[model samples]
Target: SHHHHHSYTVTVATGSQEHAGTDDYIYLSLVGSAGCSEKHLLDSFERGAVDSYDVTVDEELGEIQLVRIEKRKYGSNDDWYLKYITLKTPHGDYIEFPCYRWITGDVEVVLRDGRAKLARDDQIHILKQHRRKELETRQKQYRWMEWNPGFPLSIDAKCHKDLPRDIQFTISERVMNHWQEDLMFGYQFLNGANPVLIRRCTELPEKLPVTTEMVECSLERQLSLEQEVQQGNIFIVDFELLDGIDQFLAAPICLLYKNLANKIVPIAIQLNQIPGDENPIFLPSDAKYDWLLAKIWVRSSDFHVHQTITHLLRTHLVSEVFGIAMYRQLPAVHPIFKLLVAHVRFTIAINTKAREQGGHVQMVQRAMKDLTYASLCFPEAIKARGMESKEDIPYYFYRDDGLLVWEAIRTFTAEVVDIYYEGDQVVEEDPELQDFVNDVYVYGMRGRKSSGFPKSVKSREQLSEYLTVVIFTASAQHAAVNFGQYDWASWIPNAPPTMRAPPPTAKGVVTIEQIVDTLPDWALSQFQENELFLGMYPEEHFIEKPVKEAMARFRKNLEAIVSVIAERNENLQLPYYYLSPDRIPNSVAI
Candidate 1:
């Protein structure tokens, strides 16, 4: 019977962040052990306002499990950003349901009681209902939109304008503009967006073979080209991946060497992928602008691969799959969900808007076709490319900084999983965890049966592996490739996104003015300054003390890396600080 009435004081906390408040009427019900409370309505939410209410519940409503809150516009469509809810039970025990998310439309949003649990740990039927309904709502909001017969499933949206406000670019929104220095050109292969293409040159490519005369002077020492290659001081970046990309911009190959001066300089540049009569291997010894133009072509192609494959396809789209799948299969009470939720704040919106906005679909396909589980890991990616020997390619900040951050994330994530999952058995039995990975494989991989990703999480190590990839990709890897666009855009001549002219048939024909005419355009300005860090507003992030302690260690690890990078960058010409944890935002919030 609803006869045994009790008193409960609920305070709805409207978020204090910019655009956090709403005018929509918020109706809520507390899911307790015995029964749910009467659906109560607050006058509506105001910025930074905490309105309290008293409600009667069944006296046997022992403990609160979750709070289902719905926000509806009294007038027009609006978003109500909720911070949290606090309820004091008849027994005087206070329960907090954290909801640091945007609540829009008339949909009911379920906020679980702060404690995290696995799918099997959910004993109450209402809690299961809470889990089911939450996924149902998200799957509705984030339905899979298949593109091409075999292409990955993308988020469905009419246009970027139709996306959630948080994910859309502020539009009103780092510094290696020094890609001009032939010094920095070779550096891009080591530190730039697609650093994976470069490999130590042991055996030269028989197709575009270089002689001692081609690069003797480019090396700052009295070293023969063969000797440098033999000494392992030489590296090659072949943009062969750019070939058959439905376009031209050469899939150029450039040979670079770390001379005695410890400087990386490009010695040989071949414009086309296939070495033939029409294609020429331009050297630094060629006419000044001719070699510069060839170098520019390599960079232009680098920009394409960097933009299409490295940043957008690898970081953004891959992370989007992680974001969508996580929401679709896991509930708020799941530890993995809470652990990863912060990093995916506006992921759906950005991906949805981008899908509406834009591909490099073929390139994405090509990249994914050869991708493997080892490629996803930072150190393994470097190893597979034979770029792991630091002595050969020293000052590889992307590799160095990435290893630190990736390991730290893995450590922190594994600890969190350990706290919740007793053993590998727990992970195997976690239906939500399995479903989450399955969703990723099916939709993210576009139903590719053999995609490098694990189809199911069977052990704690596997679970941690998946979680670390998700966390690292969403934050650190994106940071590595995302923010560098500005500097590359700043100097058009250096990092040409497009070229106005074709490759030179003969040397000494390129003029300075001719090179000037070859540059193509501009966002023009903005996005130079912003604070994008992995931070949390403690008031709303309902992490328990134990997990909170683990988070403190995580932040400490980040700070330590910051100092290390800062100190190392001082002695270097161009510092790769893009992967610095302090600079990376949680989500890929463009």
Candidate 2:
């Protein structure tokens, strides 16, 4: 059928101040034009006002072939803003350009009051989730670095073929590549480089005055005194008043370890010391074997305590065992290892009551409360005691010492790998591992949950690899890309007038070589000095491999650990799913 040519004038007005701003070039497509209009509706994008475009389309080949809008901004600023266009063609075809609402990018644009206004589709739901996170962060207070103007734009892009015509635009290959690169370099810098380098420093003090002989004697004494025990090298150490003297209000229960030096060291101390006793607190440093005796006592106590709580023993012990073993093999300093040892002492103490109760909700709440207390040393126990005191000193003696914050974060994460991926090597590919891995990633991102290791076979190499991937990814890589939040759906527009940090494109368009070349002197020195912590390198293996490939390979090791756990315990089943070609989790916002 032959159609007559006709003329139509179209005018577009932005109804809302929130959308397709300056830099967002809005292009219109008419039925006769092979593509979008030759001239963009640029002036219409001015902020704080309504701008309109008038275009005359004078050839109708039946119906409106196209009434779409195309975004022209570079980087993450690219977006479409014409919701449903109104056509007044004198032909009396008062049509809505695209009937279906646009629902793809970070925000949606719609025609209201004769103008296109920016609207939120799922962002409202996402923001609701975001509020929950803000509440959590507020509760955490100083534990985490707050989001600032310098943080990366936290955004999400869901690509699909069925989006409205008015919102469809060519997805930039560079933008997507940059997004993938951010994950790649982010993982490399955080999980691969920073971790290996950070370990080279002194993790534990070498100058403790305790002699090896005293440490050995204490270890033997603690071991001999235990009546019932789970067989392991772990031990708990504590001290008693020699003559019922009140000089020291109370002594702490310390977690002890027998290092390669054959000397027992107090890896962590569960301080029950008096809040404000004027009598000088007698630390294990003042005891017979000095700190070593205290270390042995804490370990012995842990053995007894952990055996009673399924989660604590599995996660705490396994993480300690694997981490210590790995540390022993690496050239990294002892203090770092000790930090994990000592910090976990508080974790064990905090979880004790909750674990005994066997209530999951209570266990979670208590973990948060305890971690908060430990983090800030809040509620001065000294105030409780009838003595003048400042809240400066931590209630738990070992809680407020050097490197504790870094170690506490490290300790929690290291145990996470053990909890989720331990014994993954033996089980077949299945649902149990899937659920386990998913939970691990989700909790790590959100920094909640204190469940014990689901699987319990020890594999040092796999454990080391697993720790590097999960810990680094969550702590470092994700921090670089998304700034450590679980909500990953919304973002601020990065147009000319901006207040927040630049979009991922600004930080994400970096090369792998640029990162390696720009590492700090200390980190670089460690990279050159250490054996890269258990055969780590840049030969395209592990983090060096293509992002998704490395993630899948590392995931396989993690996945394997879960499968093994499920198989040994007939009560558990594993979940399975094909990984995205990108290998990165969608929740990873960058």
Candidate 3:
């Protein structure tokens, strides 16, 4: 029967005769059923000890034919073997049949009793252990990359030190604006505090000064009491003027009181309440109860907003400013910041007056909540040698790991741009958006000198990760604060002029697009480049499609992680507030 055939030259590395004695000639043959003694005639052995040979095969020979290389003793029937076989097919692809192991087919072959095979248990065990050890080594390296705050970080210790000293001028202005708003809340609370305290304590005859000064004095002291007050044991109560209250009524002063010995002792009297002078000052059912009393201090949207702002001022705002400034000092090859450019790009797009898709607050809240959970599980993750509860692994593992954070940012930015901005196509309101993008890439990631050309810096992955931590600390660490400010600022009179009216306004209904537009273009672009921004690694800024898609998914998952945490942290403003809730039918539910 005629069959198609092809020829192949197979070669093996052969040692010199001096090195491999006794085998003067090695027999190489394709094994098949045959009358070996009658047809061979010993002529195939003419090639002396050569390592290369040509062989021909066809369909009839089968794909699994073995080439046997053996040394025959002059008198003994025993044969020493060096077996090498390859499977050939009609289409002409050669597939090697490995001896003993099937998984990788790269295991060492041990010859015994004239056959080549692996020592099943011993070899498998050794190989498995070797790979397991390699994985362990890699994991250890990852662990070393995590950022260690040493102790649970304090606000000052965590404060960004490298923000331009001149930034104080700007920050102070923002703070002063915030302070004016703080006073409104202060006076409103005082409006009810004065009357309640004076009347409640009149029986004591101490006349402990019924005045709004009581609240102002305590407010200053209360600045030092955030951590304690957050725990919910004590409170400072204030008041808001009822719509019909006579303007002549001395604006009630803010009062200070504490629950001690099951008694509400007025520590300071700072306001007067013309409480329908006959109405019980402590009516439980009245809206003024929350206003007139002092125990609900931690419960107000304003208090939490203040706390969040304080946190943002010291952490995110400072840290981001410091990171942006320090990034210019980073080397061109810095992997962490280089990849972070992807994040910076999306930030610029969203921060630049493009449009809001309304997901910014939700996404921000989720990222924060997920990270909080990660922080909670970090010690356990360390102790377990990287083992984490399935839901928590991403959080615990990436929370402090710089590369992981970089990856998270990359993922977040890509998704935001892709989903809201239509992949590479984004809304560019001004030319500076692109300029900001390029400057960040050139100066920040590339470490360019003032001349605008990036200079080289000796760098490593860990250093990139360190930078990642600093950047993430600026963003993720203060998300709640940022969210808090955005959520409650409108209610605070004299909020930064930029502050949006509280939820339900058009500004409140932000898209992811609008959120990015609201971000500072310079800072946002420092983390990423515009979509039109493209280049190779290091020398140019380029972000690929898959990377963007992957990041979007990553961002979604990251959002969920933080949302979970935020859900549980009662101290934070509700994540729901960020994305104002709306109704949908069951079929449309997500």
Candidate 4:
């Protein structure tokens, strides 16, 4: 046997991100299929420098697998970052190892090739062994922490991980940067954070008792309020769920009318659950500030319900359920397991931190958890809500964009299912899948069959629909609710998360000081955040070529729908960029 010495020209890059590089001694070692390079030192990594060096190797370095880098304790240097590495092989082949991470002191970090893969993708025997070993380690650390009795599981660790090359979230630190109009107030029903709350109203609630005279001025088409109601042009959003939220919180009922101007407008607002002379229904006809303040109360209520209901319960917690059940039941090699684990990246890690740090009480989000099998299906849920009619609730960006993404996921899931499951018999016979559903049922759903979760999946279409729920919840539904926290809530009156003062019981003589006092005390940003645009993080998860092709088609549909949304948003007052597929992560890590 003969061995040939190999040489490589190494190019080390320092990130341009804020405070990314510092004066320090940085060392690196390159591990290849044949053998690894000796540990070497670089003088310094200036910010944004692609500082290259010719480092000849002693042993034949075949197929570079990893590059382990370390930062030594050098004067005043707390953290240094490496953006990427370039290796020019002897035969002129170039390989890149991307590292967008802050190199910590004495902490070991090994950056591998940046692309996406799954458990079964490894071809080499030792590589496969490493994959299994990592999963074994990951499983122990990612234990499920039950959030008290009858609750979704949370990640047990305090936070973060080293396995899967732990994607250090990359984003260009792009720095930057209205609340009321009566029309815009109703406009929120269509595209706002709480789009799911609005519904078509054939008649007002018995307790609401919205009178024709009360909202006469807000009506359109010269139609009477009663006429609008009879014509199905009226809609309502009630926050009765917030009742008895223990104090100063109004379980208000806000009503909207589809006006002749082709816009939805707030008609009347009842600020309290129980009707009384002091709790008079506030109308657009009331004193200007009175009506506006009433709308503010509704928006504040929207904020609470939006976070607890749509954002927290529906998306974040549900993703954990999928992650846990998959890990618990499906083996790493299962086709469905590979299909989903991409979307579960760092979700367990994030949920661990989120559970301890993020929140209001779990009660409100919990009460809103009506996770029936039908409701988890986007189309069925939308249909049941009766808000899908664009003619009735026009310009609903959440609904419109979500529908296309949901369908794309469903089609993609069906394709993946077909590749693994030949027929209903395959679905009926699987032990892993059967237990997965049961795991979700018993632990995730707390064994409530009344919630319409199945104990077992026995049909191809059934599994497809189930997989659709999991993927859609993780990707699109999560994206729809997660990122828009600032865009919708920056204006104090738009959607305040909390109300310090009581919701106006009697609508009269309201002043700027009063409105100011009612809003919650809040803070500001330090200027950062960006797109994690690398597609998926870990490059060694498994995928078959056919499943990969299905994902390609899925992304193509995403691009097509994004253009449709972009063109539509271009002409609008506020662009709904949250569901723009490019902005969405494969999972909930962000």
Candidate 5:
């Protein structure tokens, strides 16, 4: 049944969902081995699409056992090509020769827009589902930083089981340690991280002509006003608008990968706020509050990655309420953030009209159109202007003062302004800032990028070489990190070589090749810094505990959240399935 070689046309399956284990099979006819062997086929993949290929091998060889999959999604482009091959010989015998092929092709993701939006959406879905499950299972939620035993790799020859399981479950369901669990599901959460300040700005100046008596009067007035409206402290003492603002920004930091039963599901994000203050007032600096704000102590099994959408919404909203209290107010005389108010007001009107009429689509479109008149300002007042006028309302404002805060945000914003937005400032005059604001605003990525296929690498070695260059270049531009846009990673046999890197700086310390060579090291370092990749090291007690201890916790929390999600969605059901020892093995000795 053995054959010399085989050939087939590789094309992507239609629709986004055919990602695996489903209808869609093709045949490759084996011919005599030839030096001019491999062919490069190209296609794009969507959620639930088949990434691994299928083939009717010589029946004598039986099932092709996968040794390893070398997949490269992007070498700085949208297309992806996958080449999957099982290295084992026929009859389950491991082969010394590793069977592998290069999947090289170009893809164009015709996304209406790009990255952060999808990323943000994914973040929410993951946290909500994963956190809810954690609670239901009553299992400890592990953060990558805290995971002590560290990384786990499935290596061959681990002992007992001769082969690795196709899918592995780490924990079980139906375990609930909490005597009384709250009924609130996900969705009640709103998560936010502090934004890094790009540059320094002077403090808001006090109305310079005031006397001591006026200052006392102003304080008293502010106090009385605060008491009436129930507002918190303002940090603008010794006021001088010239003493710049301290901005704190961050990249979206964490993710919750949804896992239950034996299914590897789509990950999503849940909005939850971690106190962003470098000096947090109430909670410990590293304190992490749950989707539900009940400050009561809870076990890890209460909710792992299995939190509810309702809970996410409720907790998120509440976090925002408490969080805004942390910010100090500027002096009343500090130009009053007019553009902040303006943006808010404009946003409210657009949202209200969209909501009352239907949803925010129309309102959003109008707002986009109105951005055209930023200099003129949106003449139509937000219908919720009065509602938005509440003194405690939170605001959003951006200035082009040439400050460089956090690199990702800074790079993203600065680049967008320079490229797509035409580098126009939203607020022309100082007073104009108050005329714009929106409650729900969505933004997309903009940059000058190559839009077509990459005609770089032609062979496996060449593909690896090209990929080596792209990854290296990305790390050089980004702060040792890159987004999830590696969709077109592959090899082409006679494609021209990629363009060379620009000349090194005078010091000549940084070279793209050096970065590429050190990629494994950089990735290892990231593994240490990022907890999601590697979770908290469970203690010996955690590892030695009865398996039921983990499973009971998992199931209970999962059920509660799933019920809430299904109730809200109406299209889904909760307690999707029971998690068991067989499904979620507490011990992975291997």
Candidate 6:
């Protein structure tokens, strides 16, 4: 079956803080995704105000014309529509309606001056908010490719030092704008911070005091780090105005008013053991929420199975994911910001044997699953009539093809695994491994037999039964908008003074019986009746096995190994207690 796929070229305008001399300079920060591509930019100027942008791509026309209009503006609070008409140009000729945000329906523009005017619509600014700033700050930060943050930031401690250096030294001037924004966003995943906010033209102080009475500044910092560490990175995000509210539930109404897509969905459950007053309400598809996070998940070289699970819970803690969207009434950046930032998290293991072997193996498998899953997701979403076709839709997901390979390679620390086999002095890297990586992939590929690899990350193949970022989004707002609203309690409420991990302890020997006993009833029930997390060593001697017979044995024991890590990460915003809800056994009839 030959399925037709459409590709689109999205035109986005971006800028940075450096361009902020004043309002006009703010305009200087604006550059199209086709930066300096006059045709694209010309569409915006000619249309003045646009309702929406669509490119119906005519294969027969051979010439691709962008459809846009000055009369159409998308107004949620009021009625907005567009009319197709010939637009006169300085060349004394008219061009037919094409795809462009500036020329969409109901968008009105007064050309009192040469440049077409855009409505001072709040949503308009909201739409381009982050990208505009992203383009600006990125211009200045690119100068220091080799600079290090010192101490733990040193390359000797973490092999990821190649990252800062690699990113800095590699951007081109022409592509610097996009590259800069991407790098700025990369830190969200690297630090496990919220997705990078749109950089503003105005220069805000490096440290802005958290003033709202509703939010304790210390607690906010603490919670952020906890979420970051669990998620495996410290993310720095700006929640525009979310901090000012007092009522937790009321916070969501503000977001809904903003029309921020994704955050619109209300949460169906609460983390606390509180009983529901009535049936839980789910959020809509366009509620606004502040702060977006990139949809990338990585396991540091230091991540042991047990400790990593804790991090997973902390990362997806209810507060950070749902609260930030529903109860935090802050304005959010555009959704496209979510798309780019999602790639920031990747598995990178350094100086560890597990990384060399397991990291490469697991990550490679994940990448494959993530890629295929994404391919399936978009098509399914489109068919479900849940999505509208737009230039950014394909543009965001299409270029992300390399993410699968990136994940397969990044998840493990090189210390535990050897990524390459040493042949004399030359190192031979492992060839790509074929396997399943995420849950969505697992679920999709389930029940049907296929060639190549399965769709999921942790199912069927691989030694570990772990879960990772199968859902992709680039910003906090992105996650919030899509998954439904969450409580603010999930994020760390205070900083622990410093970010560090605890020292390692001596290993204790254990037996297979002990391993089976430790298995949570829920987990053990999922496997076949004879399965007790493990069976026996192939060589008949149990000592050769790392800890137990099956990967589940070691994974179960890993919790203790990572507890010390949580102690150190407490101050680092690493959520230590937010473990994922237990998965009850589905295969066994309880």
Number of the top TM-score candidate: 1
lDDT of 6: 0.21
lDDT of 5 by residue, 215-328 (tens): 232233334322322332211111111112121111111111111221111111111122222311111111133211111111111121111111111122112211111111
Tens-digit per-residue lDDT, 1-590, candidate 1: 11111188877777766677777777887777776677877664667777778777655666788788777678886787777788888899878787777777656777788888777877678777777887777677666776544456766667867554434441102224454468777777777656667777788898786788877777765777787778878888887777776534667888888877676778888887778767888987777788878888888888888887777777777777887787778877788778877777667676666565513667777787755555687777788777776765677888888888888888888888888989998888888888889888877786665577788888888888778888888888887777766655456665677777777767767898877777783341122354347644354454588888888888898889888889888886567778777787776766
What is the per-residue lDDT of model 4 for residues 1-590, given as tens digits with 9 covering 90 to 100?
A: 11112167888777776566678777778878888788887765666666777777778878887787877777865667676777888878777765555676646566556443334356776456544554555466445666655566555544344322232330111101135577667877777656788888877778887778777777657877778878888888888877765525677888887777667778889988888887889988888888878888898888887877777777877888888788766654567766777777656666665555723464444463576778888888887877778776677788888888888878888988887777888788877689788878887777776778888999999999999898778877777676666656666668777778886767677877788888877121121254342134343333346777877787788889879989998897668877788777777765
Q: TM-score of model 1 relative to the true fold? A: 0.89
> What is the lDDT of every predicted structure here?
0.74, 0.28, 0.29, 0.71, 0.20, 0.21
Cα RMSD for predicted model 2: 26.4
After TM-score superposition, what is the CA distance of residue 79 in candidate 1 from its true location, in Å?
3.9
User: Which of 3 and 6 is ahead in lDDT?
Assistant: 3
Ranking by TM-score: 1, 4, 3, 2, 5, 6
Best by lDDT: 1
In model 1, the Cα lDDT at residue 572 comes to 69
Give one digit per residue, the lDDT tens place, for model 6 in 38-138.
Answer: 22222221112322222222222322222321222223222211122223322343343211112112222211111111122223333345324433433
Q: Which residue segments of model 1 deviate by more than 4 Å?
A: 1-6, 17-25, 56-58, 70-78, 148-150, 160-180, 218-227, 246-248, 521-532, 535-542
lDDT per residue as tens, model 2, 396-493: 11112112222333343344343333355522232222333333323222333433222322453334434433233222222222221111101111
Off by over 4 Å in 6: 1-486, 489-548, 551-553, 572-576, 579-590
* All candidates in order of lDDT, best leading: 1, 4, 3, 2, 6, 5
Give, for candidate 5, the lowest lDDT window spanning 10 residues.
Answer: 187-196
TM-score of 6: 0.17
True-vs-predicted CA distance for residue 108, candidate 3, Å? 55
